[PDB]
Write a protein that binds this ligand. Structure first.
Ligand SMILES: O=C1CCNC(=O)N1
Ligand SMILES: [Ca+2]
Ligand SMILES: [Ca+2]
Lengths: 1277, 86
């Protein structure tokens, strides 16, 4: 009946108050206090109630939109957290998924390791185990140990404790018992059980959710309690509600128990508020757009409902989570984006941010670079007398951008805005075109900041005729608080497939969730005559690894209910990707119940006013628009919109100046003001005049579109794939090519497909020739015609327009099995024919007609036919999608324009790489001969690797003379595709780093040109046919690491010390009798990372050429017959230095059935990881069957098909890296942390580093008196 | 195949779990048609020198059937008499 909503953004505080019978809406804002968030809400309420003259005791409900929990996790300003976890897994929050954020960087630090929420000194272990799938107790709980660990945590001074055991979502009795011990021994400690925060599987994501919860728990619990107790003293007798990131109210008590759901809340309110203003006029389909000061938030609401984001995309800053969130696209192109031409002569805006501190110099603030917002001033969209209420400070400041491009005086500003428009529009079209949305039906809605500026421009590109702006864009966040309804989410993990399902267990699971939902609603005193309950489910095809959420019908679960739910899955899949699989089984993973309580809908406030243009017309200043490309200045008036009434539909180019927003209407079109205060502008979609564009803009538009096509085809292929190597390792490549085969656009998904796609398409062109027709689909994997290695299979489709070949679209990924000599992986084999099936430009669809017999023959020759068929379908779908997006610009601009735009980016890439190679002094750079362990067929004999690097001019050559001859195993590297690809990748890493280098250079044909690799025929790096090249990874890893050691004397700042430069690529496989199928698990064990000159080396992460993700343990134990019994950091210290070398992991996998094991190992009995500038050397790996038990065997690095029976375990120990610099110059304040964490021992701290740590007052501290003495007498010895 | 038998068809087969001796022996079957009516089959089979398996020629120490080489499962060589070049 009487409701208020308060939202706190970070500078301003917005308050909205509405009434049903009185029909009064009050708008009020109040300045916010950043140091104390409580003193901004209370004061706000005090200002709201006094103006209207109402009492707080009459409010039915109030909603709060704070963001304190976000700023605590982002700035890492929370509490000391302890962890009681299963013993042997003490390092899970350290490992993460072992994937770096960036694929092509060497100077990047992992945020979860560098600033961890639970430090390693406070992570403790308890001996017990609970096993899937039923939840039996394998190891009994010891009662003395748990109490001792709790008391240790209490003595240290731990404020919050996060209990995180494996499989606690299955049965939580161990965590419950631990909690009941904790509360009685440590009453004043925040406690979080992982089972009660998110009872779902995936242990890293669940423990990270729990650890974030426990990290921000003590802070926001205090803030919420203070807010509730202070509001009650004012007179508020009810309970306060809190807005979550999924859309929904939740009371204070439950909000203090799950703070993790409050983080990143407030962009969601904008989308819901936009839906509210859109449904007044009558449009159900909405596209909301908010351009703020730094970023742009985009939200697409089809028919008027929210869209939940993908699991992989759910992350708070850098840490993952499993909290439900609304899919909102954040784009860097906002108010703070700098416009510049780089050294390669290319126009780009962003992603470097200017900030609000410098500001535009025309307003009189002080700046030194051209900004996105300063471009709006030049054209006249923003008045130069708005904030205040030099003039040429903007025109003359862009001289360093205008004349340097060949632009006109006034057209420079237009370019900077059009580039942002297109960047946002292809972001939208990525998530609009494949979804199957007709843009004419939709409506664009603006928001606060600068949202209405790009409204008609973007709608023209999308072809959207309706543009709507709400009555007050500056409060849409507050209004969207009140539009949503109080709902509770209760979830469970309940894995079933529709093939073998029971309509009684499912009903009981949903009834359990319903029981707890009704019990939650009983405590809030809500009548039973208004409780609406909706059921949902997360499902996926069998073989995939991520789910889609969709609404299932109302209960009870009957026989027809199953059919309706299975149909709803296909409807929700088709709507997200745009493809329909021809087979496969659907399985539900998680179930959800939302118990909504619709109390009353928010009515539109109908108020009427009177006015005209003549009331507030102040003056007329010149304003510049785009007239068919040319800049023509024209007259423009200014007046406030708070003076006109309803039906004041007037024409003329005018600029509306509201207190919070701006609305500028294009000339020649009128804007209708409806009764509700909204405006509907008749924006043009199809017009009769062709406009002009400058040279810098046209290249970026087509290039960005080809780029977006590459990344869109990548995401479709990898999200829909059945293969785990394509899905988790991201071992794929995709992009668009021209007639000659030169790549124009590439997905950049993995370093393993660097420059290898052009070789694939050129290899196809050279074997087919003119035998290229329309509707053709081509398979290719030949490693002597450009492929990386046999298991990666590529699909190419010709592109035709009016019977003329214009290009190609291509996608490639690694299958699980290709029908080779061993399941999965292989080392000890004869030649290339032993590797499996080779495809040599085999065409899949002749003239568009599917050759059923050819598809069937291919699918009969693999051990995993269901997975392989799924991967073929996903690759064909991504190529179809890219062909569509290419023909779109062929029709839009022209065939010659598309060919020319593709040629421009090749020479941009080449120019940028050559400028960097030319700066290194010319010469010949050498190093020590590296060694590899035996080939595999004959143990003992080492294999040398010599890398010499020659630099002459703007060209670089890698000479591998002196490397070994061909070995008769698969332990060789393909020259074009692997050797050239790896040295192209290390060149890009060395000179074009993602972190240090300012701009991101796309992967085209121009990167492949400025380097050459000379490797004599008949070596391991350039073998003669028919040598097998299946196992290629470790050789090129060591080769590029030796290339780093060779160039270390001249380039220290862009290299690293001795990396592990290895892989332990494992294949565990067996035959499942019940399913009648092979089960294959392919594991990529991460290595470690040698130190750098400026920062230490991250432990436990995929190194150099690899950037894979691990499979979660709980998913593995549900899917395969195994049990990971240990996964942590190795015990011995790794390597000393000024910056420490990285530590490897020791993973102990035990097995429950007879399994076969193949390993691609390296660095067991051979050369140690090196160090630099006097840094120590790392350690070699090992492979031991049954550590500390009966049957220990010291396995070599590379094995092929060794058997394990049952109860056997493999202890895989991976190498540790080397250090960089002399250990005697390390910081004294850091070795203290290293000893307590367990990185290095106390006895070996005086020798290598030379720091004396003495125990004083119980605690260990660094003494600055005896440290300087020891450093003197440590050089001579 | 069943009723998926047309004139001018040529069929390749070597599956040892569907009647073959062992993988290296590959068979060719051709349907015989008279007045649009199936009347019989003609068939020939022999051992190739190499079938693209794990080792050249012969093999003993290998994993399973998929490591023996290529499996043909009633593959049509000539659909309706026209040669499938690809
Ligand atoms: O997953 C991976 C890592 C090693 N090599 C490869 O081809 N894929
Ligand atoms: Ca691969
Ligand atoms: Ca024979």
């Amino acid at each position: 009946m009487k409701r208020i909503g308060v939202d706190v953004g970070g500078t301003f505080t917005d308050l909205y108050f509405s009434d049903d019978d009185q029909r009064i809406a009050v708008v009020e804002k109040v300045p916010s206090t950043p140091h104390d968030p409580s003193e901004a809400v209370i004061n706000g309420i005090k200002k709201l109630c006094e103006k209207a003259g109402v009492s707080l005791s009459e409010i039915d409900q109030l909603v709060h939109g704070t963001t304190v929990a976000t700023n605590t996790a982002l700035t890492h300003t929370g509490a000391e957290v302890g962890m009681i976890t299963t013993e042997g897994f003490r390092d899970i929050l350290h490992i993460a998924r072992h994937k770096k954020p960036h694929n092509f960087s060497l100077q990047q630090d992992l945020p979860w390791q560098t600033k961890p929420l639970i430090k390693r000194r406070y992570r403790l272990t308890v001996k017990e185990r609970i096993t899937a799938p039923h939840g039996e107790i394998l190891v009994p709980l010891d009662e003395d140990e748990v109490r001792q660990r709790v008391r240790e945590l209490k003595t240290a001074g731990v404020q919050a404790i996060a209990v995180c055991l494996l499989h606690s979502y299955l049965n939580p009795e161990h965590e419950q018992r631990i909690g009941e011990i904790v509360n009685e021994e440590f009453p004043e400690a925040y406690l979080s059980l992982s089972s009660e925060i998110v009872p779902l599987y995936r242990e890293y994501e669940r423990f990270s959710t729990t650890a974030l919860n426990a990290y921000v728990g003590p802070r926001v619990s205090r803030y919420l309690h203070r807010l509730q107790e202070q509001a009650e003293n004012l007179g508020y007798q009810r309970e306060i509600l809190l807005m979550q990131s999924s859309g929904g109210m939740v009371p204070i008590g439950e909000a203090a128990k799950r703070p993790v759901t409050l983080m990143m809340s407030g962009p969601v309110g904008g989308l819901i508020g936009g839906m509210w203003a859109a449904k007044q006029s009558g449009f159900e389909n909405v596209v909301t757009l908010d351009i703020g000061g730094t970023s742009a938030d985009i939200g697409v609401a089809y028919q008027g409902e929210l869209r939940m984001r993908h699991l992989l995309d759910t992350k708070i800053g850098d840490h993952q989570a499993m909290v439900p969130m609304v899919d909102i696209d954040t784009i860097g192109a906002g108010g703070g984006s700098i416009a510049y031409v780089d050294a390669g002569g290319v126009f780009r805006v962003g992603p470097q941010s200017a900030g609000a501190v410098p500001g535009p110099v025309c307003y009189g603030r002080g700046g030194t670079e051209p900004t996105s917002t300063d471009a709006q001033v030049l054209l006249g969209r923003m008045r130069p007398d708005r904030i205040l209420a030099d003039l040429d400070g903007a025109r003359a400041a862009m001289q360093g951008l205008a004349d340097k491009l060949g632009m006109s005086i006034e057209e420079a500003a237009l370019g900077a805005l059009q580039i942002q428009k297109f960047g946002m529009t292809q972001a939208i079209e990525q998530n609009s075109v494949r979804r199957g949305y007709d843009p004419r039906d939709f409506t664009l809605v603006a928001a606060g900041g600068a949202g209405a500026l790009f409204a008609c421009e973007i709608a023209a590109e999308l072809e959207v005729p309706h543009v709507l702006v709400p009555a007050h864009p500056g409060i849409i966040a507050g209004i969207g608080l009140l539009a949503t309804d109080e709902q509770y989410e209760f979830v469970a993990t309940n894995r079933f497939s529709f093939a073998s399902a029971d309509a009684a267990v499912i009903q009981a699971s949903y009834e359990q969730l319903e029981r707890e939902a009704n019990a939650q609603l009983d405590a809030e005193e809500v009548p039973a005559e208004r409780r609406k309950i909706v059921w949902l489910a997360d499902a996926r095809y069998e073989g995939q690894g991520y789910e889609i959420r969709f609404v299932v019908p109302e209960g009870p679960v009957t026989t027809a209910w199953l059919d309706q739910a299975e149909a709803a899955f296909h409807d929700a899949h088709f709507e997200e990707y745009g493809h329909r699989f021809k087979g496969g089984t659907v399985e539900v993973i998680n179930i959800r119940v939302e118990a909504r309580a619709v109390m009353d809908e928010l009515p539109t406030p109908e108020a009427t006013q009177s006015g005209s243009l003549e009331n507030a017309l102040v003056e007329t200043r010149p304003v510049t628009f785009q007239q068919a490309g040319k800049p023509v200045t024209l007259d423009t008036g200014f007046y406030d919109r708070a003076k006109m009434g309803i039906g004041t539909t007037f024409a003329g180019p005018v600029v509306i100046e509201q207190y919070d927003s701006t609305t500028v209407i294009p000339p020649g079109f009128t804007g209708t003001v409806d009764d509700a205060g909204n405006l509907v502008i008749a924006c043009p979609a199809v017009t009769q005049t062709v406009e002009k564009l400058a040279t810098p803009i046209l290249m970026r538009v087509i290039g960005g579109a080809l780029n977006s096509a590459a990344k869109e085809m990548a995401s479709v292929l990898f999200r829909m794939s059945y293969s785990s190597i394509i899905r988790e390792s991201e071992d794929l490549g995709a992009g668009l090519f021209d007639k000659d085969g030169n790549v124009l656009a590439e997905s950049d998904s993995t370093p393993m497909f660097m420059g290898s796609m052009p070789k694939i398409v050129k290899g196809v062109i050279s074997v087919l020739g003119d035998d290229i027709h329309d509707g053709d689909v081509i398979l290719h994997n030949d490693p002597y015609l450009g492929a990386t290695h046999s298991p990666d299979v590529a699909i190419i489709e010709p592109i035709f327009h009016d019977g003329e070949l214009v290009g190609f679209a291509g996608a490639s990924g690694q299958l699980i099995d290709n029908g080779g000599a061993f399941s999965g992986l292989m080392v000890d084999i004869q030649d290339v024919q032993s590797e499996g099936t080779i495809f040599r430009a085999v065409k899949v669809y002749e003239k568009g007609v599917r050759q059923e017999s050819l598809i069937r023959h291919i699918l009969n020759n693999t051990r995993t036919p269901t997975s392989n068929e799924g991967d073929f379908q996903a690759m064909i779908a991504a190529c179809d999608l890219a062909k569509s997006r290419y023909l779109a610009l062929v029709e839009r601009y022209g065939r010659d324009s598309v060919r020319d735009a593709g040629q421009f980016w090749i020479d941009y890439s080449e120019r940028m790489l050559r400028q960097e190679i030319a700066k290194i002094p010319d010469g010949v750079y050498e190093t020590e001969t590296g060694y590899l362990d035996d080939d595999g067929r004959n143990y003992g004999k080492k294999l040398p690797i010599v890398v010499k690097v020659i630099v002459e001019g703007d060209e670089i050559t890698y000479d591998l003379t002196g490397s070994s001859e061909q070995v008769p195993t698969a332990y060789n590297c393909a020259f074009e595709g692997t050797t050239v690809s790896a040295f192209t990748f290390i060149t890009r890493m060395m000179f074009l780093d993602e972190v240090a280098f300012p701009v991101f250079v796309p992967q085209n044909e121009g990167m492949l040109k400025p380097l050459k690799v000379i490797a004599p025929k008949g070596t391991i790096f350039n073998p003669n046919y028919p040598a097998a090249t299946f196992s290629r990874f470790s050789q090129v890893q060591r080769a590029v690491d030796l290339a780093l050691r060779a160039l270390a004397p001249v380039m220290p700042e862009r290299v690293t010390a001795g990396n592990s430069a290895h892989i332990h690529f494992m294949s565990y496989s067996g035959w499942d009798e019940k399913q009648g199928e092979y089960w294959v698990y392919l594991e990529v064990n991460e290595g470690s990372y040698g130190a750098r000159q400026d920062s230490d080396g991250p432990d436990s992460v995929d190194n150099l050429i690899a950037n894979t993700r691990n499979n979660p343990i709980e998913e593995l134990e549900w899917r395969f017959p195994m049990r990971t019994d240990r996964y942590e950091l190795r015990e011995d210290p790794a390597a000393a230095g000024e910056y420490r070398g990285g530590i490897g992991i020791v993973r102990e996998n035990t097995f429950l059935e007879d399994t076969a094991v193949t390993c691609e190992g390296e660095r067991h009995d051979s050369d140690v990881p090196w160090g630099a500038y006097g840094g120590h050397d790392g350690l070699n790996a090992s492979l031991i069957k049954n550590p500390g038990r009966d049957g220990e065997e010291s396995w070599p690095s590379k094995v092929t098909g060794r058997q394990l029976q049952a109860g056997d375990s493999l202890q895989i120990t991976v190498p540790s890296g080397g250090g960089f610099g002399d250990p005697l110059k390390r910081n004294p304040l850091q070795v203290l942390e290293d000893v307590l964490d367990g990185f290095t021992t106390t006895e070996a701290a005086s020798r290598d580093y030379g720091v004396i740590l003495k125990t004083v007052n119980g605690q260990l501290t660094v003494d600055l008196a005896a440290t300087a003495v020891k450093r003197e007498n440590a050089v001579s010895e």
